[PDB]
Design a protein around this ligand. Sequence first.
Ligand SMILES: *[C@@H]1O[C@H](CO)[C@@H](O[C@@H]2O[C@H](CO)[C@@H](O[C@@H]3O[C@H](CO)[C@@H](O[C@@H]4O[C@H](CO)[C@@H](O)[C@H](O)[C@H]4NC(C)=O)[C@H](O)[C@H]3NC(C)=O)[C@H](O)[C@H]2NC(C)=O)[C@H](O)[C@H]1NC(C)=O
Ligand SMILES: *[C@@H]1O[C@H](CO)[C@@H](O[C@@H]2O[C@H](CO)[C@@H](O[C@@H]3O[C@H](CO)[C@@H](O)[C@H](O)[C@H]3NC(C)=O)[C@H](O)[C@H]2NC(C)=O)[C@H](O)[C@H]1NC(C)=O
Ligand SMILES: *[C@@H]1O[C@H](CO)[C@@H](O[C@@H]2O[C@H](CO)[C@@H](O)[C@H](O)[C@H]2NC(C)=O)[C@H](O)[C@H]1NC(C)=O
Ligand SMILES: *[C@@H]1O[C@H](CO)[C@@H](O[C@@H]2O[C@H](CO)[C@@H](O)[C@H](O)[C@H]2NC(C)=O)[C@H](O)[C@H]1NC(C)=O
Ligand SMILES: *[C@@H]1O[C@H](CO)[C@@H](O)[C@H](O)[C@H]1NC(C)=O
Lengths: 6, 23, 69, 289, 135, 61, 60
Amino acid sequence: CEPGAA
Amino acid sequence: KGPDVCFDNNVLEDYTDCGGVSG
Amino acid sequence: VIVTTLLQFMFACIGVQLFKGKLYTCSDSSKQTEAECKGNYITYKDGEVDHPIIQPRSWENSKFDFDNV
Amino acid sequence: SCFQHLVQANVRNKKVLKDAVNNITAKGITDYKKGFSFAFEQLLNYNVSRANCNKIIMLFTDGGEERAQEIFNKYNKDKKVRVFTFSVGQHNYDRGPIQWMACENKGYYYEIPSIGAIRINTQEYLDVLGRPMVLAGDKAKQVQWTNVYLDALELGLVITGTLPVFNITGQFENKTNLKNQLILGVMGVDVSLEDIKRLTPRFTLCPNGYYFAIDPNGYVLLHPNLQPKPIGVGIPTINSQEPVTLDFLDAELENDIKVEIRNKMIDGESGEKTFRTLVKSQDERYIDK
Amino acid sequence: LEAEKVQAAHQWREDFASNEVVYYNAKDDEPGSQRIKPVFIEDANFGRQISYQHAAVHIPTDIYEGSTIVLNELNWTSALDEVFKKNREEDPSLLWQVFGSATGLARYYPASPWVKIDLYDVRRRPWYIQGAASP
Amino acid sequence: VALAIYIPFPEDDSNATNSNLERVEYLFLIIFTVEAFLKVIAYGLRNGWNLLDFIIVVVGL
Amino acid sequence: RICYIHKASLPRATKTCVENTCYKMFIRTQREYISERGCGCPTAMWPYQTECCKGDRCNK
Ligand SMILES: *[C@@H]1O[C@H](CO)[C@@H](O[C@@H]2O[C@H](CO)[C@@H](O[C@@H]3O[C@H](CO)[C@@H](O[C@@H]4O[C@H](CO)[C@@H](O)[C@H](O)[C@H]4NC(C)=O)[C@H](O)[C@H]3NC(C)=O)[C@H](O)[C@H]2NC(C)=O)[C@H](O)[C@H]1NC(C)=O
Ligand SMILES: *[C@@H]1O[C@H](CO)[C@@H](O[C@@H]2O[C@H](CO)[C@@H](O[C@@H]3O[C@H](CO)[C@@H](O)[C@H](O)[C@H]3NC(C)=O)[C@H](O)[C@H]2NC(C)=O)[C@H](O)[C@H]1NC(C)=O
Ligand SMILES: *[C@@H]1O[C@H](CO)[C@@H](O[C@@H]2O[C@H](CO)[C@@H](O)[C@H](O)[C@H]2NC(C)=O)[C@H](O)[C@H]1NC(C)=O
Ligand SMILES: *[C@@H]1O[C@H](CO)[C@@H](O[C@@H]2O[C@H](CO)[C@@H](O)[C@H](O)[C@H]2NC(C)=O)[C@H](O)[C@H]1NC(C)=O
Ligand SMILES: *[C@@H]1O[C@H](CO)[C@@H](O)[C@H](O)[C@H]1NC(C)=O
């Protein structure tokens, strides 16, 4: 899956 | 279930091979 | 002036027998011999383990040594 | 960690322990006597699953002036637990008691001055741990098969054999025995998972039939759901090194009966079983019976 | 057995410059050691340019391949290649056969060029750690 | 000399020597308190260095 | 056997030798430019440093 954000 | 062969605590082992007394 | 330069020569002579060739160092801190300080080694940018960069290993003397008078 | 005992070194249990030693903060006075009373008491549980084998303690300090000769005489007086001491960092503290801990406890003193020596130093405790196996003679020469992992040279999913080699120069007289306590190296021959699949033909069955085999851990060796990609450990975040260990119960839907078959197959038994199941479809959108 | 017997007669040398060892360094496109230029043939089974004549040698980046310890191995890990060949000839299905030495160098057969930054060390591989000790 | 030995540690750490010098710098305060107690009821603080001694003593207590 | 020895570091002229160690005399900071190759393992004055080899023309 593609990464997220943090 | 783990391996049934184990190898530790042998009598004829030279423990006097540290890195502070032999270096 | 002559006294000052004579004391300069004197202190240089004492310092030679004190730091004669002991001021060598390697780029990699884990090697402490010119023979060992060879090839390449890994250097990490700003102490980050995720950015390794290959550098050569060099036996470099200090900028101001004490090898001779 | 959230763990209070010894846990197996999975790919998941090894991520909880690497996200918690990446968060610690330094504050307070040091106390080796309390610290080593914890370590010797956590390797005494026997309530939980354990390897029941080499029992090592791996101290990560900088320096100190405490020898803790009492703690090392209450628990570890029969020389059953090794103690490896690491003196990490660039500092000036007395590394004297630390060198004494390793020698008196059948260990080794390792020094990590900078980040460049981390990779070569935290891999040599396998030379100390290999001493009791080298002296065992030709009874430790047993082929061992690793878990399924991706090859370094891109080849797919492979399993590798293993057989150590012994420094046996001067064995005719048996007089040196100074460096003959270390292994020369470890060999290996790769067996690709595709090679095993040729030995299990499936075209005489309907598409719903298949073969699978498991480790004595539940990890599948071959399975229709085993894909040539590394397994996941959590939600990714952006700001071949690990084996492909997929458990049998996590490869297909889990039942109460399937756990019974998994335990029997781990034990090494033989048998048959017929039972209605819920089998997930290949498109991961349907389920039938 | 052949890696044990051959090591028992290495006759430890000190200056590996007058007599040079011949080996194929995988990580390449130097005095004291001669390299070989292999022929290579794209093949099935494997997917890379494999060579059925010698075995490549992988030495990690932070290991100087002309030190007196690395060069002293490469001399006794050269009778292995005759056993790397008889094994495959008897059973043509053999895949990679590798000898992971304790000095960091690994000699695998059949020879093939190695795969950004390189951080491979044979002493950390799972197939090596499981055989160097017990659980 | 006690202050010379003391050695500071990052973020509250301490060895045994710092756990003994903090004990010694209680006798080293009682001595000065005893000295300062006799002078006031003997000499009635305005000598300068006597005033400095008084400030360091009261800050010590 | 052959490594170029000269006094003026700029022209880099060639001179014969007999020692089996070819050296490399460079500055302690600007090491890219090689001031003086040659034969033997001599002593470096200031500001200079020497690396010595095992064969002829090993320095490169
Ligand atoms: C398998 O085990 C055998 C022994 O069981 C082992 O063979 C031994 O190898 C060492 C190499 O270090 C030989 O040492 C000779 O004697 C001294 C002692 O080291 C060396 O002189 C110095 O050695 C140190 C090593 O720390 C070095 O830093 C130093 O530079 C050396 N001195 C100088 C002036 O350079 C000698 O150099 C060395 N002999 C020669 C001819 O060079 C032992 O003699 C070997 N023992 C036997 C019985 O042959 C072998 O290496 C092991 N196999 C592997 C793969 O490690
Ligand atoms: C370690 O270093 C050397 C690098 O190749 C090798 O030295 C070789 O030793 C061989 C045996 O001593 C020599 O072969 C011939 O052996 C016969 C004895 O049956 C003798 O005639 C001579 O000693 C020798 N020469 C001739 C012409 O017959 C090799 O010539 C010699 N090679 C070199 C380059 O000198 C060692 O073999 C090597 N060890 C291993 C295990 O490879
Ligand atoms: C599990 O470990 C604990 C301590 O680590 C063992 O201690 C027992 O705890 C229970 C209740 O606290 C009681 O049985 C006793 O008070 C403790 N001692 C013994 C000897 O039982 C406990 O025994 C372990 N469980 C086992 C071995 O099944
Ligand atoms: C798949 O879904 C079924 C139905 O939702 C679940 O199995 C039921 O679970 C409940 C609660 O334990 C039981 O009371 C029922 O008897 C079960 N149905 C059966 C056995 O047919 C469960 O979530 C899944 N079934 C599994 C895992 O076997
Ligand atoms: C190897 O396996 C093949 C088939 O898998 C078999 O025919 C052969 O006898 C085995 N042994 C050898 C030495 O080839």
